[PDB]
């Protein structure tokens, strides 16, 4: 009805200076955006370092395979048993091309499945990719990209020098089978003349390779299998070495951690999707104001406290963990000096921030101690992994849990030598961790100075149970009341103003990452009062069918109750009985309901309606 909607055109251009850093300076120069960008860049470089370090062995094996073929009819090929998640391994293939171009041992063409709908297009993109690849190391029209031109172009340059011709097929299962078989036969026909190596991107198993390759195609194939690591193993490596690393001041809550790991383990093995979900959690945390720019290292946090305005103090006063801290103050002038003076709180904030950072440093060390103590036990009640005890220790009080009582009982059944060996393992692991990871980080001297006398006291109790059944209970009591009670509290029993550092809000991030369109459509077609907040459209029960409803919900409630086939006449009479122009409103409801896919018109039948959602 508008000038923007046209009856002829479908796309509209609003070009403003287009030729052949989106936001303004008002938010980029704010401190919360700078600290968010810095924290995200650190975490992204750490995850990229971990993924490259995980891939480097199989990368070296593939480069040795291609170079060993260059040192030397069937074509040599390399099936790479990669994971389910296809978007993750394009970086692996990019690193493989970079290592093959670094030694100048070969030149690589990457054949996506979208470019190879026919044999003609597959050969054309193959020759064009190799020609443009060697052009880009140091242009033909695609209809002139033939194998004879590839032979002449190879004879012109590299026959006087032997550069292999690596052909990546990253999505092996998405290729057409006949086009792939003809392509393998073509590449096998040109062996001797043109050196072809065919690395693959097989995702499911080797049975797919052995099934899609027939008798005659596989006889010209000399494949060698490599194995990339599993996606849960890479997830556990990232979760232990990034999201639990003490150097980062932004911690997730147990519910958010369990939500993201539930998304990974239950729905999709995409660690890229986990990365983007953690990025959305980081963005939703840091965009609460300039108060949340304090979530960093200590000295920059003190500069940030000295930078703070008054609204940010009002957002550190509104958080629910501040109210029991104000409530426990006995002095009456002190609450006056905290709540309205706004400079005494500015003097107070370094102590609270130091206590919070020290609490999470002690939490990480004590968590490592208790994971090595508990997870070596049989039946694993609190879990073996560090992340499970992280979730359980942050969610609720660990001591009151019955599973902790089960751990105490099954740890009390042990003999002397195995028990002393296990606690000595926990001692040496925590000492090694305090040496290697807490020491170079700032405010790590205070964490080691706090935690080390309790470790020495537990080691003295271990010597006492060595020199002397009953003393195992004293060792367990020293372990509890020196490590588990003090440094493994829940999130509710945290220090004051710990929110600036944890991210507890899971409802908004859950509805914004996980998308549920059918839930929103079902809730807007069952009770419209939930969205509109009418004073008259409220339903005490969801099938009441009140008469003041919106025009679509009456139609939805009249056809949800009926059978699969929907007659138009009796339902038109029912909609007339609930609430001329009424025929136009009914037909408009037909158009709105058919637009969403809840029904489809029975064109095949005598102009009736047919429901699709049951």
């Amino acid at each position: 009805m508008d000038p923007t909607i046209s009856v002829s055109k479908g796309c509209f251009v609003y070009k403003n200076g287009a030729t052949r850093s989106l936001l303004g300076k008002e938010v980029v120069q704010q401190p919360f955006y700078e600290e968010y960008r810095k924290a995200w860049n650190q975490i992204n470089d750490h995850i990229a370092d971990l993924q490259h370090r995980s891939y480097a062995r199989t990368l070296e094996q593939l480069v040795d395979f291609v170079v060993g073929q260059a040192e030397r009819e069937v074509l040599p090929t390399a099936a790479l048993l990669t994971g389910i998640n296809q978007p993750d391994h394009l970086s692996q293939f990019t690193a493989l091309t970079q290592r093959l171009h670094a030694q100048r041992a070969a030149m690589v063409c990457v054949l996506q499945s979208r470019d190879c709908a026919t044999l003609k297009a597959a050969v054309e993109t193959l020759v064009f990719g190799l020609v443009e690849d060697n052009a880009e190391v140091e242009r033909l029209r695609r209809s002139q990209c033939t194998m004879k031109q590839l032979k002449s172009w190879y004879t012109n340059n590299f026959d006087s020098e032997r550069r292999q011709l690596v052909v990546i097929l990253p999505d092996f299962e998405c290729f057409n089978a006949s086009v792939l078989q003809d392509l393998i036969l073509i590449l096998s026909a040109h062996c001797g003349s043109l050196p072809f190596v065919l690395v693959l991107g097989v995702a499911t198993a080797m049975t797919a390779v052995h099934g899609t390759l027939p008798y005659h195609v596989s006889s010209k194939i000399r494949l060698r299998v490599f194995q990339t690591q599993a996606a849960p193993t890479g997830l556990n490596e990232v979760l232990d070495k990034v999201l639990l690393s003490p150097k980062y001041a932004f911690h997730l809550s147990g519910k958010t951690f369990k939500f993201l790991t539930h998304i990974f383990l239950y729905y999709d093995f995409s660690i890229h999707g986990f990365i983007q979900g953690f990025k959305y959690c980081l963005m939703e945390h840091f965009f609460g104001g300039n108060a949340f720019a304090l979530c960093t290292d200590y000295s920059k946090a003190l500069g940030r406290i000295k930078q703070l305005t008054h609204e940010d103090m009002e957002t550190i006063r509104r958080l629910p963990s501040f109210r029991p801290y104000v409530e426990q103050i006995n002095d009456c002038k002190r609450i006056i000096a905290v709540l309205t003076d706004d400079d005494y709180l500015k003097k107070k904030l370094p102590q609270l921030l130091r206590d919070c950072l020290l609490h999470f440093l002690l939490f990480r060390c004590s968590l490592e101690f208790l994971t090595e103590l508990v997870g070596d036990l049989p039946r694993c009640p609190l879990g073996k992994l560090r992340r499970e005890l992280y979730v359980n220790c942050l969610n609720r009080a660990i001591i009151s849990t019955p599973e902790y009582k089960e751990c105490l009982q099954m740890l009390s059944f042990l003999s002397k030598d195995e028990f002393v060996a296990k606690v000595n393992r926990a001692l040496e692991r925590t000492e090694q961790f305090l040496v290697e990871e807490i020491a170079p980080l700032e405010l790590g001297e205070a964490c080691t100075a706090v935690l080390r006398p309790k470790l020495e006291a537990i080691r003295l109790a271990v010597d006492e149970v060595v020199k002397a059944g009953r003393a195992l209970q004293k060792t367990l009591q020293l372990i509890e009341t020196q490590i588990v009670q003090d440094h493994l509290r829940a999130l509710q029993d945290a220090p004051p103003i710990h929110e600036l550092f944890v991210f507890s809000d899971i409802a908004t991030v859950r509805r914004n990452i996980i998308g549920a369109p059918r839930a929103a459509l079902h809730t807007a077609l069952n009770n419209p009062h939930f969205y509109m907040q009418c004073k008259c459209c409220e339903l005490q029960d969801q099938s009441l069918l009140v008469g003041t409803l919106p025009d679509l919900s009456v139609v939805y409630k009249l056809h949800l109750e009926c059978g699969r086939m929907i007659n138009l006449f009796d339902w038109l009479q029912a909609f007339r009985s609930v609430v001329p122009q009424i025929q136009a409103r009914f037909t408009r409801a037909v158009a709105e309901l058919q637009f969403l896919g809840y029904i489809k018109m029975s064109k095949r039948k005598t102009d009736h309606a047919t429901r699709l959602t049951w």
Partner: peptide
Amino acid sequence: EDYEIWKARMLAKAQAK
């Protein structure tokens, strides 16, 4: 309760203390 009435009750109790 709201932050405003909580802070106001705390300040009124501190002034009455």
